[PDB]
């Protein structure tokens, strides 16, 4: 069974039981809001990380794919003869 | 099973609307309002914190020794 | 009671009486053997004794920037 | 990554709990495990790309707290040791939250459950990242209040009202200890960022390191509930059973041991902190395994397990060997989500019920259930080839390694301590799954056997096991208790492995003692608390269902039951503390209020001012009779008093005091 | 008519509006109440332009008008650092004031609009003026206007407390009076320009120390001479309330920064063992009292007192970070205390009509979002980082420690007790059972005013408490020139 509730209160966090007819939508939309947050810290965080080491280039270290500081050495490294 | 969400936001039951005290014109244009056109004009605002001063000073005093590398040497 | 209507409180006596004692406790304190000592004991005492030890220890020690072969006291 | 791995479980915290009625209870279980999980990847990746390739990565965003000589960052440091506490933390999460998904579906607020869930995790993640103790303050505080959000998780019940108010203040203690000791490290070194701190360790003045060293491990000592300031973890198990698992047995525990190992390259410095964290850690081993033997409450014997494991990290920690405590710490959490997850499932199979007086049976009722008990217990009580043998097992064996007095001493207790491990484990597993059913006959009731005749599609419910998302949690943990340890060994262990080149945790070569460890042991010690642990098994196993009457004759004596209350009562370390120590301050209060605030300072202050005075007041009026005979008489009366005080050269002092005696005279009536 | 003029004015302008309008318009009360609203806005709106013009590193005076036709007593304002973020918390905070009494007063409106109005140009004034005797001339100034608030619009005890506030005030105030005297005296002038560069004689200084002392711990209030705020803080009007905690309290700390650091610094040094024993009692005795006390509203009172020794020891530690860390921890406790008050006067105290914490439990159960800035605000009270008040906090208790370790650890101890009081309170009113069967009727939750004005107030503590730096960097060079003292090699340079 379900406790009994007041339904005259209002709270942000949806309250006893609450999912909205809608909550397959919203979910959706507060996701791409989720997501769009990520992207611009991962933007940042691939532009100011900051490594005093080199991976070696068979090792696996997917990070040098979207970082500037390794791209940046490994473009410049690629210069060779 | 769930319930369909509830609940009366400020008290207001879903029968009206809320009832404005007259506050709300003041407070939310007024005084937020000019709270956020502050917060951008202070973007634009020159700094002049004794700090960034200071390191400027800091930075070429360090140069002059070898902790320091210098972008314009001599 | 107020200015403003609030809502409808079970306001109990008990409750009500012992909140208005508090409140006017002031104007049954006594000096007596007891209330003397306590209030020497929080007042006089424990604040000297405070007292004594930031006096005695003002300036003791300083630990800017200590290393091995020095000391932190510095009196 | 590095900082997507910070803030996708605060988004998911935020959306969850602040717009719960937009997405609804689906809704934010969807976000909430989708955030973690995605965050627990990334964390896998990031093991690969710190820990194996050894890239220390520094990410610095903005200044926090910049006066003069402090310039606190919100920077992230991330290191060989971050990513090692980095990997459980995620993934007993995300276990946690697809845990949850069950246990809490009766739950009227499950919105607001996960979003406590996921903001505890943003905050074991901030503490750990952090590269300055001011900073890793803030998740240390972080967990802590998400620690009291979810003990009081159901906050219509007195007593866990009075279990997060213990797990709030317990730790607060600890904080002003942790508050005091960054106050040390400012003073002397000017900032408490982690690059500062440990380049300078080994210059500053001994003395210093033992100011410093002391406070944070009493800090330490809150967070990891130790002998002295542990009395919020048993206590902390009234929240539900997840939070137990996830945030009082695997991840905020192991905060205090965290605070030790970072501060590594700080604390080498001083064997004074060092030998207190080692015969501390002895100390809680022994005193948490005896009263653990005696609880009837399922999570309340755990708890007691926790703090033991704790403190054979802090033990360990004693032992300049940190790497060992990381080690028992990734592989204790495992084990340990393991034990109180399948257990939340025994208190969710019969009636919400976890008294063990009453549990018997289910051992073909909970089938699964039981099986991962004894992978956990098994890996608890470090069984050979095991996770936990890999850990705790070799712990024992380095403080034997170290040849001295404490290093042999702290053997023989944790061994005692390792004795009494067992047989808690043998009475979890044993009086919930291989004993003769004590629970009523509800519990045990299948449909195959005819007892009903008209109800027969309901009034049975026999103890049924649960659904996907319970089991699958259950039996991912299982496996870690199996390979993860082994496979680990030769990263945490080694011989002379170089996982820590980083100085993410440092050992001074003086104090060095693994290499004794392996060879001069000898091994009759090497292979002593397996002998003791196959062995003590069986006389638990013996004095149950075989003799069943030898432990109830050493009860009813007058000194086993004298003893056997002291260990259940917990070695009365809360009677004295809540009696001498937490009503002493309410008393103080209740003075301070009633015999000063409202009282002499009232007398001695205004109140007998306004007393006085009014006397006063009256007494002199009552002179103005409006006698106008009586006036010239007061006049001549005053007249020659001025003539006496000039024309003799009085003194002045005369005077005043005559005046004072005037006002003394009027302040008596009549 | 320089910013700083313009400041003291709008008020002014707002009273006279208030008290002559019905003689162009029976007017409607929600008229007084918006002319008294936009008056305080404008007067904020003209403070933010002032901060943005504001220089950060400058050792002269800023936005100060040119008088010339010198008089006996002449008004001369200007700004730095150290005065820029209180005249701001007065700005900011009196508009949160006027709006968290909209619907409470129901009686005598256009006095408490025009009493409210006065005491904003006066609390402005005091922070403003160039000169010690003009100090002393607005800190007193607004005693009768908080004299005939609390008799007007008070609760059922505001005779005793208005008497109290006025007498304690007046009396310590009067021994500040004689030790100013003295200084212009000495000096001929109590301009600051030329004041602060004069040169006081130890025993002069140990005896205008007292003298100013005397009135500082009456106001901070220390314990055992906080009976007033007990009373007064408690029986006054919420808007009162919200001037008296976060303000107020405010003019004895921005006053130990113009009347003793520059002035007297050989006796704050010599007496610092006094301040700090004095401290150290205020910080243990009230933590301890607030743990007993049952009037919602003068726990929370209390803990006024609690903190207000934490920033009053941090003045006294000649540190850079005990200075900062006071002013800081004083405007934390501003936002922090005045939300504290709406919570406890104006939430719970119309919903009930009483304030003993008897009589309440379990309104998270239908008051969810006063629960949730409750807990926020019981959090900042308890001094949680990413808070302004941690910060505060830190830094005042770092400097306290370094000056003096042995009050500095026992300061320290605050850290449990406030958390102790803070997180209790919160417990007995939000959580602890079901809702109090003394509710006949139901409660509803916040009000739409009644949630913003604790958004508001809850935004500016935690922004603040990420970024302190907004505040911080207005600090760093006028705080320098308050610090005594000299190292052995970078002293005289040559
Ligand atoms: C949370 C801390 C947890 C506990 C950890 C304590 C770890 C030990 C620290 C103890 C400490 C740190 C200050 C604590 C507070 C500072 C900041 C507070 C914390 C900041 C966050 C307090 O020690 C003080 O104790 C005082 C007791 O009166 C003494 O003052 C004076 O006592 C009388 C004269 O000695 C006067 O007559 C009296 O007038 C003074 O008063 C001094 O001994 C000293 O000032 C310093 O202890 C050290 O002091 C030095 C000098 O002694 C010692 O060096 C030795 O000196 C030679 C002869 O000594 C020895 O031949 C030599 O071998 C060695 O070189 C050390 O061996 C050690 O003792
Ligand atoms: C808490 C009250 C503090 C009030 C601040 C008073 C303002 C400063 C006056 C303190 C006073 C007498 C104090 C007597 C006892 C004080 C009250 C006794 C207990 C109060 C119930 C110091 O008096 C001493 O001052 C010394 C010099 O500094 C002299 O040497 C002494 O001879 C002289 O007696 C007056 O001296 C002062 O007068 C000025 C001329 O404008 C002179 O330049 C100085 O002479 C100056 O110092
Ligand atoms: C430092 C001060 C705070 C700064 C941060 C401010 C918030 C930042 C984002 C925090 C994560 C999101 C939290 C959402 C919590 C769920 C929403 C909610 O409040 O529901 C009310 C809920 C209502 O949820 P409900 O849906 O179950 O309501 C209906 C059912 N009843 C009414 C019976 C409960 O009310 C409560 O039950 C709890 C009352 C206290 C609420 C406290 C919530 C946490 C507030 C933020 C904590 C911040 C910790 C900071 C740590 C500092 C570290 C140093
Ligand atoms: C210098 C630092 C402090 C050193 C001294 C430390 C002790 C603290 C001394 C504080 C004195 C100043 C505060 C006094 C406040 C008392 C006000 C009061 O009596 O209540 C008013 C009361 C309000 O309380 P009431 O209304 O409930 O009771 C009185 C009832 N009627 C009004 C009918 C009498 O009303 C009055 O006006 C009656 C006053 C009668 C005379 C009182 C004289 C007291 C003031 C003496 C000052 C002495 C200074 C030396
Ligand atoms: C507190 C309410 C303020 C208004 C509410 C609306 C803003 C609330 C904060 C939301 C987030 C804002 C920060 C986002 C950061 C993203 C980067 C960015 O925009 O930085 C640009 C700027 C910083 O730009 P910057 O750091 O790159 O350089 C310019 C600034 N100088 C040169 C001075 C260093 O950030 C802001 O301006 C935000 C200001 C927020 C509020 C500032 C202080 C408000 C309180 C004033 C009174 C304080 C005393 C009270 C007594
Ligand atoms: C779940 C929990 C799992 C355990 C958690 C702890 C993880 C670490 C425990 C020990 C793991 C040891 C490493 C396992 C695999 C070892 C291996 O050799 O894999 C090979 C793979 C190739 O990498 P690469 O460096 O490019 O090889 C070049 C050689 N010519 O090397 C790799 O990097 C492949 C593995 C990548 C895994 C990424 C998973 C993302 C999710
Ligand atoms: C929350 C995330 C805030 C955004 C993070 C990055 C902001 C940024 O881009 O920098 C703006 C500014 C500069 O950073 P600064 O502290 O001056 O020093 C950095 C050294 N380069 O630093 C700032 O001004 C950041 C101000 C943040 C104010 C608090 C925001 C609270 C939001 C809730
Ligand atoms: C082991 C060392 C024990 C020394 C002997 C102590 C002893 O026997 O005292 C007697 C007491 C009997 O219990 P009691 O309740 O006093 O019986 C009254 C019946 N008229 O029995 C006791 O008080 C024994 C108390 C045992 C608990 C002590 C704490 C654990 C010690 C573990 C060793
Ligand atoms: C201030 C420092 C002390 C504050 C409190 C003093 C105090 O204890 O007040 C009590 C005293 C006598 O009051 P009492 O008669 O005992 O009570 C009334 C009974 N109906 O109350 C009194 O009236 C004591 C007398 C105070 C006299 C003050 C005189 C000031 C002028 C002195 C001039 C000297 C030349
Ligand atoms: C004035 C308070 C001090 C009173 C001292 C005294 O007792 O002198 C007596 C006289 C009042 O006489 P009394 O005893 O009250 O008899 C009245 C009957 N109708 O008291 C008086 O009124 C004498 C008036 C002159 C007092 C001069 C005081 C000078 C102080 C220096
Ligand atoms: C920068 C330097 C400034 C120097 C001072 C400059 C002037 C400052 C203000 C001084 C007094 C100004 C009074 C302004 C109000 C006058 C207009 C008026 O008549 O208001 C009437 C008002 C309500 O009464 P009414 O509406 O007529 O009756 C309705 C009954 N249903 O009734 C009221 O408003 C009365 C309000 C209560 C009394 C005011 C607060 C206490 C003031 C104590 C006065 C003594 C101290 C003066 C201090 C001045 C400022 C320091």
Same mark, same amino acid.
């Given at each position: 069974?379900?406790?009994?509730?007041?339904?005259?209160?209002?709270?942000?966090?949806?309250?006893?039981?609450?999912?909205?007819?809608?909550?397959?939508?919203?979910?959706?939309?507060?996701?791409?809001?989720?997501?769009?947050?990520?992207?611009?810290?991962?933007?940042?965080?691939?532009?100011?990380?900051?490594?005093?080491?080199?991976?070696?280039?068979?090792?696996?270290?997917?990070?040098?794919?979207?970082?500037?500081?390794?791209?940046?050495?490994?473009?410049?490294?690629?210069?060779?003869? | 099973?769930?319930?369909?969400?509830?609940?009366?936001?400020?008290? *207001?039951?879903?029968?009206?609307?809320?009832?404005?005290?007259?506050?709300?014109?003041?407070?939310?244009?007024?005084?937020?309002?000019?709270?956020? *056109?502050?917060?951008?004009?202070?973007?634009?605002?020159?700094?002049?914190?004794?700090?960034?001063?200071?390191?400027?000073?800091?930075?070429?005093?360090?140069?002059?020794?070898?902790?320091?590398?210098?972008?314009?040497?001599? | 009671?107020?200015?403003?209507?609030?809502?409808?409180?079970?306001?109990?006596?008990?409750?009500?009486?012992?909140?208005?004692?508090?409140?006017?406790?002031?104007?049954?304190?006594?000096?007596?053997?007891?209330?003397?000592?306590?209030?020497?004991?929080?007042?006089?005492?424990?604040?000297?004794?405070?007292?004594?030890?930031?006096?005695?220890?003002?300036?003791?020690?300083?630990?800017?920037?200590?290393?091995?072969?020095?000391?932190?006291?510095?009196? | 990554?590095?900082?997507?791995?910070?803030? %996708?479980? %605060?988004?998911?915290?935020?959306?969850?709990?602040?717009?719960?009625? &937009?997405?609804?209870?689906?809704?934010?279980?969807?976000?909430? +495990?989708?955030?973690?999980?995605?965050?627990?990847?990334?964390?896998?990746?990031?093991?690969?790309?710190?820990?194996?390739?050894?890239?220390? @990565?520094?990410?610095?965003?903005?200044?926090?707290?910049?006066?003069?000589?402090?310039?606190?960052?919100?920077?992230?440091?991330?290191?060989?040791?971050?990513?090692?506490?980095?990997?459980?933390?995620?993934?007993?999460?995300?276990?946690?939250?697809?845990?949850?998904?069950?246990?809490?579906?009766?739950?009227?607020?499950?919105?607001?459950?996960?979003?406590?869930?996921?903001?505890?995790?943003?905050?074991?993640?901030?503490?750990?990242?952090?590269?300055?103790?001011?900073?890793?303050?803030?998740?240390?505080?972080?967990?802590?209040? +998400?620690?009291?959000?979810?003990?009081?998780?159901?906050?219509?019940?007195?007593?866990?009202?009075?279990?997060?108010?213990?797990?709030?203040?317990?730790?607060?203690?600890?904080?002003?200890?942790?508050?005091?000791?960054?106050?040390?490290?400012?003073?002397?070194?000017?900032?408490?960022?982690?690059?500062?701190?440990?380049?300078?360790?080994?210059?500053?003045?001994?003395?210093? @390191?033992?100011?410093?060293?002391? +406070?944070?491990?009493?800090?330490?000592?809150?967070?990891?509930?130790?002998?002295?300031?542990?009395?919020?973890?048993?206590?902390?198990?009234?929240?539900?059973?997840?939070?137990?698992? /996830?945030?009082?047995?695997?991840?905020?525990?192991?905060?205090?041991?965290?605070?030790?190992?970072?501060?590594?390259?700080?604390?080498?410095?001083?064997?004074?902190?060092?030998?207190? +964290?080692?015969?501390?850690?002895?100390?809680?081993?022994?005193?948490?395994?005896?009263?653990?033997?005696?609880?009837?409450?399922?999570?309340?014997?755990?708890?007691?397990?926790?703090?033991?494991?704790?403190?054979?990290?802090?033990?360990?920690?004693?032992?300049?060997?940190?790497?060992?405590?990381?080690?028992?710490?990734?592989?204790?959490?495992?084990?340990?989500?393991?034990?109180?997850?399948?257990?939340?499932?025994?208190?969710?199979?019969?009636?919400?019920?976890?008294?063990?007086?009453?549990?018997?049976?289910?051992?073909?009722?909970?089938? /699964?259930?039981?099986? @991962?008990?004894?992978?956990?217990?098994?890996?608890?009580?470090?069984?050979?080839?095991?996770?936990?043998?890999?850990? &705790?097992?070799?712990?024992?064996?380095?403080?034997?390694?170290?040849?001295?007095?404490?290093?042999?001493?702290?053997?023989?207790?944790?061994?005692?301590?390792?004795?009494?491990?067992?047989?808690?484990?043998?009475?979890?597993?044993?009086?919930?799954?291989?004993?003769?059913?004590?629970?009523?006959?509800?519990?045990?009731?299948?449909?195959?056997?005819?007892?009903?005749?008209?109800?027969?599609?309901?009034?049975? &419910?026999?103890?049924?096991?649960?659904?996907?998302?319970?089991?699958?949690?259950?039996?991912?943990?299982?496996?870690?208790?199996?390979?993860?340890?082994?496979?680990?060994?030769?990263?945490?262990?080694?011989?002379?492995?170089?996982?820590? @080149?980083?100085?993410?945790?440092?050992?001074?070569?003086?104090?060095?003692?693994?290499?004794?460890?392996?060879?001069?042991?000898?091994?009759?010690?090497?292979?002593?608390?397996?002998?003791?642990?196959?062995?003590?098994?069986?006389?638990?196993?013996?004095?149950?269902?075989?003799?069943?009457?030898?432990?109830?004759?050493?009860?009813?004596?007058?000194?086993?039951?004298?003893?056997?209350?002291?260990?259940?009562?917990?070695?009365?370390?809360?009677?004295?503390?809540?009696?001498?120590?937490?009503?002493?301050?309410?008393?103080?209060?209740?003075?301070?209020?009633?015999?000063?605030?409202?009282?002499?300072?009232?007398?001695?202050?205004?109140?007998?001012?306004?007393?006085?005075?009014?006397?006063?007041?009256?007494?002199?009026?009552?002179?103005?009779?409006?006698?106008?005979?009586?006036?010239?008489?007061?006049?001549?009366?005053?007249?020659?008093?001025?003539?006496?005080?000039?024309?003799?050269?009085?003194?002045?002092?005369? %005077?005043?005091?005559?005046?004072?005696?005037?006002?003394?005279?009027?302040?008596?009536?009549? | 008519?320089?910013?700083?003029?313009?400041?003291?004015?709008?008020?002014?302008?707002?009273?006279?509006?208030?008290? !002559?309008?019905?003689?162009?318009?029976?007017?409607?009360?929600?008229?007084?109440?918006?002319?008294?609203?936009?008056?305080?806005?404008?007067?904020?709106?003209?403070?933010?332009?002032?901060?943005?013009?504001?220089?950060?590193?400058?050792?002269?005076?800023?936005?100060?008008?040119?008088?010339?036709?010198?008089?006996?007593?002449?008004?001369?304002?200007?700004?730095?650092?150290?005065?820029?973020?209180?005249?701001?918390?007065?700005?900011?905070?009196?508009?949160?004031?006027?709006?968290?009494?909209?619907?409470?007063?129901?009686?005598?409106?256009?006095?408490?609009?025009?009493?409210?109005?006065?005491?904003? =140009?006066?609390?402005?004034?005091?922070?403003?003026?160039?000169?010690?005797?003009?100090?002393?001339?607005?800190?007193?100034?607004?005693?009768?206007?908080?004299?005939?608030?609390?008799?007007?619009?008070?609760?059922?005890?505001?005779?005793?407390?208005?008497?109290?506030?006025?007498?304690?005030?007046?009396?310590?105030?009067?021994?500040?009076?004689?030790?100013?005297?003295?200084?212009?005296?000495?000096?001929? !002038?109590?301009?600051?320009?030329?004041?602060?560069?004069?040169?006081?004689?130890?025993? =002069?200084?140990?005896?205008?120390?007292?003298?100013?002392?005397?009135?500082?711990?009456?106001?901070?209030?220390?314990?055992?001479?906080?009976?007033?705020?007990?009373?007064?803080?408690?029986?006054?009007?919420?808007?009162?309330?919200?001037?008296?905690?976060?303000? #107020?309290?405010?003019?004895?700390?921005?006053?130990?920064?113009?009347?003793?650091?520059?002035?007297?610094?050989?006796?704050?040094?010599?007496?610092?063992?006094?301040?700090?024993?004095?401290?150290?009692?205020?910080?243990?005795?009230?933590?301890?009292?607030?743990?007993?006390?049952?009037?919602?509203?003068?726990?929370?009172?209390?803990?006024?007192?609690?903190?207000?020794?934490?920033?009053?020891?941090? #003045?006294?530690?000649?540190?850079?970070?005990?200075?900062?860390?006071?002013?800081?921890?004083?405007?934390?406790?501003?936002? #922090?205390?005045?939300?504290?008050?709406?919570?406890?006067?104006?939430?719970?105290?119309?919903? !009930?009509? =009483?304030?003993?914490?008897?009589?309440?439990?379990?309104?998270?159960?239908?008051?969810?979002?006063?629960?949730?800035?409750?807990?926020?605000?019981?959090?900042?009270?308890?001094?949680?980082?990413?808070?302004?008040?941690?910060?505060?906090?830190?830094?005042?208790?770092?400097?306290?420690?370094?000056?003096?370790?042995?009050?500095?650890?026992?300061?320290?101890?605050?850290?449990?007790?406030?958390?102790?009081?803070?997180?209790?309170?919160?417990?007995?009113?939000?959580?602890?059972?079901?809702?109090?069967?003394?509710?006949?009727?139901?409660?509803?939750?916040?009000?739409?005013?009644?949630?913003?004005?604790?958004?508001?107030?809850?935004?500016?503590?935690?922004?603040?408490?990420?970024?302190?730096?907004? #505040?911080?960097?207005?600090?760093?060079?006028?705080?320098?020139?308050?610090?005594?003292?000299?190292?052995?090699?970078?002293?005289?340079?040559?």
């Amino acid at each position: 069974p379900k406790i009994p509730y007041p339904k005259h209160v209002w709270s942000p966090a949806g309250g006893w039981y609450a999912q909205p007819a809608n909550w397959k939508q919203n979910t959706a939309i507060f996701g791409l809001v989720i997501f769009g947050i990520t992207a611009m810290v991962w933007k940042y965080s691939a532009e100011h990380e900051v490594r005093h080491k080199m991976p070696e280039p068979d090792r696996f270290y997917p990070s040098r794919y979207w970082v500037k500081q390794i791209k940046d050495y490994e473009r410049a490294q690629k210069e060779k003869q | 099973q769930y319930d369909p969400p509830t609940g009366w936001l400020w008290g *207001v039951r879903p029968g009206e609307k809320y009832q404005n005290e007259g506050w709300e014109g003041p407070f939310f244009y007024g005084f937020w309002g000019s709270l956020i *056109v502050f917060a951008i004009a202070y973007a634009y605002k020159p700094d002049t914190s004794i700090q960034t001063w200071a390191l400027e000073e800091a930075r070429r005093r360090l140069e002059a020794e070898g902790i320091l590398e210098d972008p314009n040497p001599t | 009671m107020a200015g403003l209507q609030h809502y409808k409180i079970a306001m109990d006596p008990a409750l009500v009486r012992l909140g208005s004692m508090i409140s006017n406790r002031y104007k049954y304190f006594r000096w007596t053997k007891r209330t003397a000592l306590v209030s020497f004991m929080y007042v006089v005492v424990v604040p000297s004794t405070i007292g004594y030890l930031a006096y005695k220890t003002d300036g003791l020690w300083d630990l800017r920037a200590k290393r091995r072969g020095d000391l932190i006291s510095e009196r | 990554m590095y900082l997507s791995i910070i803030i %996708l479980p %605060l988004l998911g915290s935020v959306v969850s709990g602040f717009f719960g009625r &937009k997405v609804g209870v689906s809704g934010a279980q969807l976000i909430t +495990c989708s955030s973690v999980i995605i965050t627990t990847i990334l964390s896998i990746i990031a093991f690969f790309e710190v820990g194996f390739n050894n890239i220390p @990565v520094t990410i610095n965003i903005f200044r926090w707290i910049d006066s003069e000589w402090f310039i606190i960052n919100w920077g992230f440091q991330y290191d060989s040791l971050t990513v090692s506490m980095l990997i459980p933390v995620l993934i007993i999460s995300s276990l946690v939250h697809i845990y949850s998904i069950s246990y809490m579906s009766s739950d009227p607020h499950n919105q607001r459950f996960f979003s406590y869930l996921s903001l505890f995790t943003f905050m074991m993640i901030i503490l750990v990242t952090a590269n300055n103790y001011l900073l890793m303050f803030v998740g240390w505080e972080g967990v802590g209040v +998400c620690s009291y959000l979810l003990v009081s998780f159901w906050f219509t019940r007195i007593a866990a009202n009075q279990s997060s108010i213990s797990a709030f203040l317990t730790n607060r203690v600890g904080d002003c200890f942790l508050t005091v000791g960054m106050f040390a490290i400012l003073w002397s070194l000017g900032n408490l960022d982690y690059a500062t701190v440990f380049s300078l360790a080994p210059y500053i003045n001994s003395n210093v @390191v033992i100011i410093i060293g002391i +406070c944070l491990l009493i800090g330490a000592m809150a967070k990891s509930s130790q002998v002295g300031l542990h009395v919020w973890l048993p206590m902390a198990m009234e929240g539900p059973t997840p939070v137990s698992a /996830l945030i009082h047995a695997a991840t905020m525990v192991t905060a205090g041991v965290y605070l030790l190992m970072r501060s590594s390259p700080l604390i080498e410095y001083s064997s004074t902190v060092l030998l207190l +964290c080692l015969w501390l850690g002895a100390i809680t081993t022994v005193f948490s395994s005896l009263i653990g033997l005696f609880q009837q409450d399922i999570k309340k014997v755990i708890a007691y397990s926790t703090m033991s494991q704790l403190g054979m990290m802090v033990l360990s920690i004693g032992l300049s060997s940190y790497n060992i405590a990381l080690f028992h710490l990734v592989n204790h959490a495992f084990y340990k989500a393991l034990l109180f997850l399948g257990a939340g499932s025994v208190i969710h199979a019969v009636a919400d019920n976890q008294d063990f007086r009453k549990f018997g049976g289910l051992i073909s009722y909970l089938p /699964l259930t039981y099986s @991962v008990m004894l992978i956990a217990s098994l890996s608890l009580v470090a069984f050979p080839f095991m996770t936990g043998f890999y850990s &705790k097992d070799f712990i024992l064996e380095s403080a034997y390694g170290q040849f001295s007095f404490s290093g042999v001493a702290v053997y023989i207790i944790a061994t005692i301590g390792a004795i009494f491990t067992t047989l808690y484990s043998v009475k979890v597993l044993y009086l919930t799954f291989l004993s003769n059913p004590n629970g009523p006959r509800t519990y045990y009731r299948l449909a195959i056997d005819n007892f009903f005749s008209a109800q027969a599609i309901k009034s049975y &419910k026999p103890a049924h096991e649960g659904d996907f998302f319970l089991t699958l949690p259950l039996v991912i943990l299982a496996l870690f208790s199996i390979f993860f340890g082994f496979i680990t060994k030769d990263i945490f262990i080694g011989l002379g492995s170089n996982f820590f @080149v980083d100085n993410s945790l440092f050992i001074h070569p003086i104090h060095e003692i693994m290499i004794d460890t392996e060879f001069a042991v000898p091994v009759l010690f090497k292979l002593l608390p397996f002998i003791f642990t196959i062995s003590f098994s069986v006389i638990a196993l013996t004095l149950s269902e075989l003799l069943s009457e030898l432990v109830i004759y050493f009860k009813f004596s007058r000194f086993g039951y004298n003893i056997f209350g002291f260990f259940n009562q917990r070695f009365l370390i809360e009677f004295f503390y809540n009696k001498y120590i937490t009503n002493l301050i309410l008393n103080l209060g209740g003075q301070i209020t009633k015999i000063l605030d409202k009282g002499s300072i009232e007398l001695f202050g205004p109140y007998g001012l306004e007393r006085g005075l009014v006397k006063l007041s009256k007494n002199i009026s009552s002179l103005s009779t409006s006698h106008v005979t009586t006036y010239a008489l007061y006049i001549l009366v005053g007249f020659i008093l001025y003539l006496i005080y000039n024309n003799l050269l009085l003194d002045y002092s005369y %005077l005043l005091l005559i005046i004072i005696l005037l006002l003394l005279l009027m302040m008596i009536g009549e | 008519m320089s910013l700083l003029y313009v400041l003291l004015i709008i008020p002014i302008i707002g009273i006279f509006l208030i008290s !002559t309008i019905d003689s162009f318009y029976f007017f409607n009360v929600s008229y007084y109440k918006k002319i008294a609203l936009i008056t305080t806005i404008l007067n904020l709106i003209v403070s933010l332009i002032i901060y943005i013009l504001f220089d950060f590193s400058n050792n002269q005076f800023q936005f100060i008008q040119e008088n010339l036709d010198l008089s006996f007593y002449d008004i001369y304002l200007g700004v730095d650092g150290v005065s820029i973020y209180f005249v701001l918390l007065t700005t900011i905070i009196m508009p949160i004031a006027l709006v968290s009494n909209w619907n409470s007063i129901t009686n005598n409106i256009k006095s408490y609009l025009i009493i409210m109005l006065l005491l904003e =140009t006066l609390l402005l004034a005091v922070f403003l003026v160039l000169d010690v005797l003009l100090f002393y001339i607005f800190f007193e100034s607004i005693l009768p206007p908080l004299f005939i608030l609390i008799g007007l619009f008070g609760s059922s005890n505001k005779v005793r407390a208005s008497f109290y506030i006025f007498l304690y005030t007046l009396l310590g105030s009067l021994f500040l009076l004689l030790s100013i005297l003295t200084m212009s005296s000495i000096v001929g !002038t109590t301009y600051f320009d030329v004041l602060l560069k004069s040169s006081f004689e130890y025993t =002069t200084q140990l005896f205008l120390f007292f003298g100013i002392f005397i009135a500082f711990a009456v106001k901070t209030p220390v314990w055992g001479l906080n009976s007033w705020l007990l009373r007064a803080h408690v029986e006054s009007p919420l808007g009162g309330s919200i001037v008296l905690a976060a303000i #107020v309290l405010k003019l004895s700390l921005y006053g130990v920064f113009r009347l003793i650091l520059p002035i007297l610094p050989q006796a704050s040094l010599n007496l610092t063992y006094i301040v700090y024993a004095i401290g150290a009692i205020t910080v243990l005795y009230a933590s301890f009292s607030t743990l007993r006390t049952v009037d919602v509203k003068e726990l929370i009172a209390y803990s006024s007192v609690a903190h207000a020794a934490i920033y009053l020891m941090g #003045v006294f530690s000649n540190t850079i970070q005990g200075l900062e860390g006071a002013i800081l921890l004083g405007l934390a406790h501003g936002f #922090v205390s005045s939300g504290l008050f709406i919570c406890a006067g104006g939430i719970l105290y119309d919903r !009930t009509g =009483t304030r003993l914490i008897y009589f309440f439990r379990g309104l998270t159960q239908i008051m969810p979002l006063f629960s949730l800035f409750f807990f926020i605000l019981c959090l900042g009270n308890a001094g949680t980082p990413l808070t302004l008040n941690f910060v505060g906090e830190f830094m005042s208790l770092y400097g306290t420690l370094e000056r003096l370790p042995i009050a500095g650890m026992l300061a320290s101890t605050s850290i449990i007790f406030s958390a102790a009081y803070s997180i209790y309170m919160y417990n007995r009113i939000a959580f602890g059972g079901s809702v109090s069967l003394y509710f006949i009727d139901c409660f509803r939750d916040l009000t739409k005013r009644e949630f913003f004005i604790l958004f508001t107030l809850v935004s500016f503590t935690v922004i603040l408490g990420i970024y302190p730096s907004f #505040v911080l960097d207005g600090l760093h060079y006028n705080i320098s020139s308050v610090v005594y003292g000299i190292e052995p090699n970078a002293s005289y340079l040559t």
